[PDB]
Amino acid sequence: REFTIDFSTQQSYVSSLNSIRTEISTPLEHISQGTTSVSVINHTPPGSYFAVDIRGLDVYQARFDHLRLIIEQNNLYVAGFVNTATNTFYRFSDFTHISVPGVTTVSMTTDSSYTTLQRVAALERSGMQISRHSLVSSYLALMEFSGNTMTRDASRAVLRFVTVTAEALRFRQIQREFRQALSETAPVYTMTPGDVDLTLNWGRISNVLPEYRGEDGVRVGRISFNNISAILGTVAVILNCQPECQITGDRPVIKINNTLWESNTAAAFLNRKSQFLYTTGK
Amino acid sequence: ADCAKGKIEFSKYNEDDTFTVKVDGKEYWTSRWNLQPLLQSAQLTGMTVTIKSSTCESGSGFAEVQFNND
């Protein structure tokens, strides 16, 4: 399947994301209002992907229109990017199982981890700035890119595009914050430490939210939600609980004082022995 | 040296009371008593830990470890 993400306006951008979510995921019964929900990605076989055509970098103009992202459907990872002018798929080393017909596949030495990408890009995501202007620069970098090894500028471009496509699909919070950059004012979106933490906790969140039944709160490691509006304002799409669903153990949640806790978080602060014995037993 | 950076694949309480973690495919032990709950908490939450030691071969000891959120 092919989808467009159109950056022309906040309307076109949010419309694009919503359409993708509707096609690839199903609302949770207990976290859904109108057609705005936390949804679970529908099961697809391993290696299934969808394509995202990038449009509207120049508002409503049919230009800058040769970038396509290949997204593994079950986990929303960007597996690589396609230059549709050269018909070339630059594929990260951790996605050799993703086969795209009709294109020349360039298998890259670079893996898609944020650790690798930030290193090669010399750019940390916390404090990363994204604007319409830097999305155009990112587009140009990706269409100039050639070869099997990610360059600094190509890595910066992927960091920016992954944030405003796949991570925004996952997190309505990132959708809402970034979309201001698309307005006529053209402000800068700055990725926050909270945004970053959300992306790092996506699997854990995905394991916990299917258990939510209207508790007063949800606590998943560093992540806290205090009501359904906070959940819906933050999270849009979760994994179908995939290996990212589980860290250790087999208990998704503990209800404590009408708060739904990730059980591993509670376990990780309830595993201390007597403090006096701890501190004096050096 | 930075010996390993990754999630804790397993931990083990050893007969000599040291504590072993497996990180990035290699096993490392520590006698530092303060680290035992901290390392189990890292394992429980899938924290990325950075094991630093003068030797990095599997079976090396360590006393220095960083606990990261990413």
Partner: peptide
């Protein structure tokens, strides 16, 4: 395994 993009 560290978070993939």
């Amino acid at each position: 395994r560290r978070r993939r993009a």
